[PDB]
Design a protein around this ligand. Structure first.
Ligand SMILES: Cc1ccc(C2=NC(=O)C3=CC=C[NH+](C)C3=C2)cc1
Ligand SMILES: [Zn+2]
Length: 208
C-alpha cells in the first residue's frame, strides 16, 4: 500500500523539513553515548510516505479527538527514531512500536529535538550502534528518522526531571524541568494518532 516519493532538494518542502531536522539538534547529557557526537547532519534523501489506508485511519482518529477537544486536534510535526522504521512506513504505528520501558509508560514516543530521536535509531540507548561497524557514533552508515504528523488532543503535562492515556487526556507531554536547552517529548497510546509522513535518510557529521 505504501509508496515513497523522493523530494528534490530544490523543493521548498524538502528545505523546510531539512531545516527542522538541522535546527533542532542539541547536546545530550550522555556526551554522545547513545546517538553519537555531532552538531549537524548530512541529509541524503527525504521521501514523502503515501499510504491512503493509513492516512484515512489517521484522519478518522484525528476527527474523533478534535470533537472531544473543542474542535482542536492539537496536531504537531514531531520526530520518531526506531529500529522498526521500515515496518512503520508499510504497516503504520501500533503496539509493537511502543517503548515499553519509557518513563511515561508503554506508549509511542516522539521528540521535538531530532537529535533525541537519533538516539533510538539503533535501539534503546543506541543499542550496539550501526549493524556494520557496531559504532553508536558511526559517521559512515546511513540512518533514518521519521518526521510525523501527531495528534495530541488534550495532553497531560508532566514536568520532568500498550498503556492508556491518563483519564480525560489523549497524550502525555514530557516537559523538561532541569535541562534548560531540551525541547519537549510526547507520548501517544494509540497508533492511529500518528502518520509517518516523511522518511529522512541521513548521516551524522563529525565536528571539525
Ligand atoms: C523500541 C523503541 C522505539 C522507539 C523509541 C523512541 N523513539 C523516539 O523517537 C523518542 C523520542 C523522544 C523520547 N523517546 C523516549 C523516544 C523513544 C524507543 C524504543
Ligand atoms: Zn557504521
Amino acid at each position: 500500500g505504501t509508496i515513497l516519493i523522493d523530494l528534490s532538494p530544490d523543493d521548498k518542502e524538502f528545505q523546510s523539513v531539512e531545516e527542522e531536522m538541522q535546527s533542532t539538534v542539541r547536546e545530550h547529557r550522555d556526551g554522545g553515548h547513545a546517538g553519537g557526537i555531532f552538531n549537524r547532519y548530512n541529509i541524503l534523501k527525504i521521501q514523502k510516505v503515501c499510504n491512503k489506508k493509513l492516512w484515512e485511519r489517521y484522519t478518522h482518529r484525528r476527527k474523533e479527538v478534535s470533537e472531544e477537544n473543542h474542535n482542536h486536534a492539537n496536531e504537531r510535526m514531531l520526530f520518531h527514531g526506531s529500529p522498526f522504521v521500515n515496518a512503520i512506513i508499510h504497516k503504520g504505528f501500533d503496539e509493537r512500536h511502543a517503548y515499553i520501558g519509557g518513563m511515561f509508560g508503554a506508549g509511542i514516543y516522539f521528540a521535538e529535538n531530532s537529535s533525541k530521536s537519533n538516539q533510538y535509531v539503533y535501539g534503546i540507548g543506541g543499542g550496539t550502534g550501526c549493524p556494520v561497524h557496531k559504532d553508536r557514533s558511526c559517521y559512515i552508515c546511513h540512518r533514518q528518522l521519521l518526521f510525523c504528523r501527531v495528534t495530541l488532543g488534550k495532553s497531560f503535562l508532566q514536568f520532568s526531571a500498550m498503556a492508556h492515556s491518563p483519564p480525560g487526556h489523549h497524550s502525555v507531554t514530557g516537559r523538561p524541568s532541569v535541562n534548560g536547552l531540551a525541547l519537549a517529548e510526547y507520548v501517544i497510546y494509540r497508533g492511529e494518532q500518528a502518520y509517518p509522513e516523511y522518511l529522512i535518510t541521513y548521516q551524522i557529521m563529525r565536528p571539525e
